[PDB]
Symmetry: C3
Subunit: 176 residues, 3 copies
């Protein structure tokens, strides 16, 4: 009966789509694009600069202002942070929390400061250094997202008891 | 004769595939995914921790235990390694070999510690530092895969003759 | 009238293409490939080594030879550069320009030293360090492409007036 193998037609599953008999690959421009062939991102990179007030959440109840540059290039966002002021610590380890609500400025493309579900699944490396009693301490530390808006880094304070650390730098990156 | 331009039908070459008249893009979830549009990886990142006994293969016949964190995020795996113990070196340059067979633990997703054929094609940068006679030496070094399971890094030892280096750190990453 | 929903046929928009009833995804091998599913790059990585004469363009009218290793892996190119000689600086900030025309050698795949339009859109982080009067200065600096062949980095010189800096290292990367 009268049909050909073509009669029933083809359906196209995302990221493939058809419109008006024209079949396309839908491309997130932060990840990929076409220049005849499928290649890497076309979206413009940006370098965001803002202040992030980080909060001590264990081994500190203090806060510390961080000057942040976030270099967003494709779906990678790299953070370079430097403190102003001292952070008061109370123990040999401190947890420092970075919640998007504590950024001033607040970039328009806030999506670039939010990790992917995949990336959120694990602890991630963070380079930390700071000065305490005129010595530099520097550590390969780790951060972890507790939710899509909030990560916390854990690092040693270079001593015990109450002390004030300064010149805290934080370097890390996330996949968004 | 009786056919239309549709009669002979369309064939779909990988990573495109058809099943039941539904055309799909097959996506490696470590590389890409769809959220309407084609975007970056959906697979969960992981932070693997294990001990890697590295072997001196020139300028040393010794071995050294490395504490390794491997942060696997998409098809990128970044290594952060720190030694325990001393490595005995005999020359001004040492070659230190990292073979998957010498990892204890042995993560289930061992595929994350294997570089792609493309990445294997070239030497890759490795940051190395260690202490020798109370001085720190630190170098931009290079590694190269001799096979898919084995890479070797080459770095200066900071002197000559027989000596023992300690606090060896290795930072590098691979594309898998 | 006589047509079916198949009569008019399907058109395929780049990076999808049809030839001889076979529908393909065209893949830039520096970005992606297929191993049944769509995955990451298949092109061979390379480690290019060349000399780059950088030019002082503000706070210096001098030039400085840089020994460059460019690790090209997919569409990421990472630069590791170390100077030979001194650079004469005249101010507390220097601008150092890296134009492809000043590379000797001149790799065949010069496309790997050219950033994407997207990446070019923003300033990018550059790690800089150098020695001046027997002290090391080290900074998170920034570079910016003024055109597809030319970027300039800006960094502090660690003092004022006329001076000569040495052991300048530059580490950064670009998306191509
Ligand atoms: Zn039917
Ligand atoms: Zn026929
Ligand atoms: Zn018609």
């Amino acid at each position: 009966s009268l049909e050909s193998t073509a009669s029933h037609g083809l359906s196209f599953s995302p990221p493939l789509s058809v419109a008006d008999g024209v079949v396309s690959l839908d491309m997130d421009p932060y990840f990929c694009s076409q220049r005849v062939s499928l290649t890497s991102y076309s979206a413009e990179a940006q370098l965001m600069q803002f202040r992030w007030m980080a909060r001590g959440t264990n081994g500190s109840s203090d806060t510390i202002d961080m000057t942040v540059n976030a270099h967003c290039h494709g779906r990678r966002t790299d953070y370079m942070m430097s403190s102003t002021g001292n952070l008061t610590v109370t123990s040999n380890v401190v947890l420092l929390t970075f919640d998007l609500s504590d950024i001033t400025h607040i970039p328009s493309d806030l999506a670039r400061l939010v990790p992917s579900a995949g990336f959120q699944a694990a602890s991630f490396p963070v380079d930390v250094s700071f000065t305490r009693d005129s010595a530099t301490h520097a550590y390969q530390a780790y951060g972890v997202y507790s939710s899509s808006r909030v990560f916390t880094i854990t690092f040693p304070t270079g001593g015990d008891g109450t002390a004030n650390i300064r010149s805290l730098t934080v370097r890390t990156g996330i996949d968004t």
